[PDB]
């Protein structure tokens, strides 16, 4: 299915939050012409961020997906590449899933000011899906330079509310979209 | 694909919050291949939650869409199935649909609910949680929780549940009339 | 499955307070009977370019007004020069399939034309969310998207973006929004 690129819907541990494969990132990208429709959720399984409270610091971490100029996931990404593939051999290109570098340029007169906001999508998510357990997600397009990436999608996850009773970092699903490179 | 399953865009009262058809649920599910793109909004028209304030309790209610193995709406659902159907223009195909499995939330992504950290099942991923705004006013937050496959009622194969509520103190009564909310989810097929 | 858009890296193309004082980036993509949209706003000069608690009002309104063919009316805050389908071209002739449904989101009615037997939703034609200035989690603002709620220019359809904030900002910050995704039911 050339219209869906994903982690598979029920992944094994596939994502580094603190150490490699300590988390399960479920990410599906679906191509709707020139816009990608995405859904993302994160379950931290082991380690520092599996169960959080107010004494865990910092209260944010970053998950980078780094892509080359063919849209292939680079091995330095926090997301393990083993099962990152079209919905059904590692794929050879996925440029049409990549966030536009014209809409969302890599970092570099009022008419020369570059938007610092437009390459980010920021919202609350809710741990365990509970309305009284807000956290946040920041989706960032093409803001990384690591591994000489041509494209990137970064997920920053965190929280700010004071939690004295420890709770699993297990996020509600978040929908977003972005302008595709082609 | 690219078909829509919906309540019609201008439904008559079609949904139970407290009693049958005491509310207008507008819900459209549009298939974008492996994901469903959805928009939902609720106007409660009569009963306990039509007009809310800080003296209305509890401050949450639940609307269950329960589906069988063909993705057909079960009678126990809060939504009346009379006008829950595939789109035709601004209305519905006349005959009740026979199957809608491609519109169901995946039971692989969102399994039905059932100490080893390695076997932990995500409690978050089957829910989408956000503020909505009553009357579309920025100063009238409430909330929506969309839940996939979390019901057991009527031996459903699939479910979509909408929990609506609010937390802010409203001393003056206001209608429970939500801003539209967009979400997507992984489709069963 | 076409996209109607401002182009992804627009030149100043929008009036918040004065012509060309802002850059609105907006893409509408058709997915059958729903439009999938992404929007963001960079105010580049004037009252709302750098905001703080001493600026009032703390909301402003960007109207996209369309005629019966889905064509952008020049009265809109958005300049229509580069509002067109994604692809040297011609202004588009029709985009009704991209308009917000007037059955889902009807225009306001008069005392004359209001049916007292029907309760009309005031919320359903609005989408309301936070956006974040600079994409910083500690700089919330808000966006309100409104469908078909204008009467300006005898529009057949409209999409209105209200942007604002409520948090007290002592130190001034640029009104430069994170991107916001939404969808709506299309006219056809
Ligand atoms: C959509 C949105 O951001 N709404 C928020 C409104 C809004 O900012 C104002 O009505 C616009 O002027 O403000 C809310 O309350 C905040 C309060 O939470 C904060 O601590 O103080 C500010 C004033 O400085 C407001 O009083 C509101 O009216 O309830 C919050 C609301 O946002 C949310 C997420 O509910
Ligand atoms: C989904 C929602 O609306 N969650 C809100 C929650 C809820 O309304 C009450 O818990 C209901 O009782 O109230 C809060 O104050 C809270 O932290 O608990 C704020 C929280 O909203 C945010 C943006 O974090
Ligand atoms: C994305 C998010 O959740 N931002 C929240 C922010 C954040 O949690 C801390 O800044 C992290 O440390 O905290 C706030 O109190 C703040 O104003 O700064 C509330 C704000 O949420 C809203 C709905 O405005």
Author numbering:
A (entry chain A): 179 to 266, 273 to 292, 298 to 371
B (entry chain B): 179 to 292, 297 to 371
C (entry chain C): 180 to 266, 271 to 371
From the primary publication:
We employed glycan array screening with a library of about 500 glycans to identify SA-containing glycans that support efficient binding of the HAdV-D36 FK. Notably, HAdV-D36 FK demonstrated selective binding exclusively to 4-O-Ac-3’SL, contrasting with the preference of HAdV-D37 FK for 3’SL. Glycan probes containing a 3’SL motif capped with the unmodified Neu5Ac showed little or no binding. We solved the crystal structure of the HAdV-D36 fiber knob in complex with 4-O-Ac-3’SL isolated from echidna milk, and we observed that the lactose component is not ordered in two of the three complexed glycans and does not seem to contribute to the binding. The only detectable contact mediated by the glycan stem is formed between the poorly ordered O6 atom of the galactose moiety and a backbone carbonyl function. The lactose stem is generally poorly ordered and only partially visible in one of three cases.
The HAdV-D36 fiber knob domain (FK), which mediates the primary attachment of many HAdVs to host cells, has a significantly elongated DG loop that alters known binding interfaces for established adenovirus receptors such as the coxsackie- and adenovirus receptor (CAR) and CD46. Our data suggest that HAdV-D36 attaches to host cells using a versatile receptor pool comprising sialic acid-containing glycans and CAR. Sialic acids are recognized at the same binding site used by other HAdVs of species D such as HAdV-D37. Using glycan microarrays, we demonstrate that HAdV-D36 displays a binding preference for glycans containing a rare sialic acid variant, 4-O,5-N-diacetylneuraminic acid, over the more common 5-N-acetylneuraminic acid.
